[PDB]
Amino acid sequence: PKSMQCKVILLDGSEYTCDVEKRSRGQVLFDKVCEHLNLLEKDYFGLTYRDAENQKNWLDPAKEIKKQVRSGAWHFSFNVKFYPPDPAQLSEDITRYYLCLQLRDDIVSGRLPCSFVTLALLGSYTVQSELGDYDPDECGSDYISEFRFAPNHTKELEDKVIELHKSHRGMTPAEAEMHFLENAKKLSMYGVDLHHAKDSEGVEIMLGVCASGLLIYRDRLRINRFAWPKVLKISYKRNNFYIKIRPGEFEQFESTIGFKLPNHRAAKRLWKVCVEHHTFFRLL
Numbered sequence: 504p505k506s507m508q509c510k511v512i513l514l515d516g517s518e519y520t521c522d523v524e525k526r527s528r529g530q531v532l533f534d535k536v537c538e539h540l541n542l543l544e545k546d547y548f549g550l551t552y553r554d555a556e557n558q559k560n561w562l563d564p565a566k567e568i569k570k571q572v573r574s575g576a577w578h579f580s581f582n583v584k585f586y587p588p589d590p591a592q593l594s595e596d597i598t599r600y601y602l603c604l605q606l607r608d609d610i611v612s613g614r615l616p617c618s619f620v621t622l623a624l625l626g627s628y629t630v631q632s633e634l635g636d637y638d639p640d641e642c643g644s645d646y647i648s649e650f651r652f653a654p655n656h657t658k659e660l661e662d663k664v665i666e667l668h669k670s671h672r673g674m675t676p677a678e679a680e681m682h683f684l685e686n687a688k689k690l691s692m693y694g695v696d697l698h699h700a701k702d703s704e705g706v707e708i709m710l711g712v713c714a715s716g717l718l719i720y721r722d723r724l725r726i727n728r729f730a731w732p733k734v735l736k737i738s739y740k741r742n743n744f745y746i747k748i749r750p751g752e753f754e755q756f757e758s759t760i761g762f763k764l765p766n767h768r769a770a771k772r773l774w775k776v777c778v779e780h781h782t783f784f785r786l787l
């Protein structure tokens with residue numbers, strides 16, 4: 504019974520290798536990866552793969568792997584799919600640990616923009632979690648941490664991490680990770696999946712998908728936000744994506760709002776992530 508080798512990049516940067524039957528649904532591989540990670544609160548996570556256009560796609564656990572990766576390698580990443588708006592409500596510390604690992608990559612990558620002071624505070628909690636109480640013996644005036652804290656490291660940032668790390672004496676790893684998450688969850692781009700688009704006039708915009716709803720980023724002064732309950736239908740057609748808005752109070756007609764995506768694949772991808780978010784955050 505023929506099996507395909509799968510390679511999964513984990514959130515710590517290491518590689519997990521396993522075999523699944525070649526006609527396996529995504530759930531088979533995801534279950535193996537979550538068992539490897541000792542992860543029970545699996546609903547927030549997913550696997551990604553790169554399509555023939557090198558775009559990130561979620562592996563649908565309900566569909567055959569072979570019908571998603573198609574002609575590409577069986578190579579995946581383990582990622583947070585649904586960012587909990589309140590990580591304190593998660594039942595296990597280990598779930599919060601994986602969510603911290605994802606957010607550290609979101610920060611270093613620049614997907615999650617962050618002030619100097621918040622970069623330093625987040626860094627200080629990671630250092631406290633992983634090394635424990637501050638020790639001057641490992642850091643003179645010229646200390647640089649092996650830890651990656653930011654898209655661009657400066658001596659000033661390193662110095663501020665150390666100053667805040669000193670303040671965390673006695674803090675345990677779960678406690679430090681919770682403080683990490685209490686800060687990160689407040690960031691304006693926390694858990695926002697961004698998609699390049701044009702408005703119905705051809706003006707370049709960004710669509711953000713998140714727990715609360717759909718964001719349109721237009722000209723810096725114009726951000727429009729559509730809470731999920733205001734959204735009755737998500738649809739795509741060719742390179743176009745549309746949202747059907749509930750009729751407002753005393754309004755006779757629903758309204759549909761339309762956007763242009765880079766290509767058909769990008770419109771279908773944005774539709775699927777919106778539907779998934781709407782379903783997940785309707786139930787959570």
Ligand SMILES: CCN1CCC(Nc2ccccc2F)CC1
Pocket residue numbers: 688689690691692693695713715716717718728729730731
């Ligand atoms: C603080 C983290 N997060 C930032 C994006 C914001 N998005 C949003 C707000 C209201 C309605 C629809 C929306 F998409 C939700 C909170």
